[model samples]
Target: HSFEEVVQTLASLATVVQQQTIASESLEQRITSLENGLKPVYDMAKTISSLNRVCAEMVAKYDLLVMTTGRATATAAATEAYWAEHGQPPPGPSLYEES
Candidate 1:
């Protein structure tokens, strides 16, 4: 190749190097933005997971509490058996009672 061609190619190559260096530095901003994006997503996902776990815990507790109260699975059966024995349901104590 001619010396002139080599000098011209080298000159253009130098300019190209400067532009690519600037582009490479700009990559830092995109990576930083991506880092911020992933952080919020993970935090929100974990928070939602925690909320769902709490909801499940509350629902399980409520189900157990219903069983404890004897009002969930056997109210009708209990009252029927009580009535069969006494011919009537038992009356609950009231605030006003005759002495």
Candidate 2:
């Protein structure tokens, strides 16, 4: 049994994890400063990510909403599930789309 090597590996792994945590914290701080400095661009980017909030705020006024996907994995399943629950034909443009 190479218990010595096992313990050595774990000791190095612990140090590696601590080093990674420190590095990640510094990366996070850099990103935080960048986000703060680019507050306008950050807010604009946030809107696309936080679309649910945008839709919620707009409510019925929302002009466009869609469930769409390509032959790719989960999106295909999700689009199918959406229609399957409603029990209907393929929505107007069930296929892949880009705009």
RMSD (Å) per prediction: 13.2, 18.4
Across 1-99, the per-residue lDDT of candidate 2 in tens digits comes to 699999999999999999999999999999999978876886778787799777777986665688675557665666668768876745566466422
lDDT values, one for every candidate:
0.75, 0.78
- Give the range where candidate 1 is weakest over 10 consecutive residues by summed lDDT: 90-99
> Which parts of model 1 have CA positions greater than 4 angstroms off?
1-11, 61-99
Distance from true location, Cα of 58 in model 2, Å? 44
Using TM-score as the measure, the top candidate is 1
Task: Give the CA lDDT, 0 to 100, for residue 62 in model 2.
Answer: 61
Off by over 4 Å in 2: 40-99
Give the number of the best model, judged by lDDT. 2
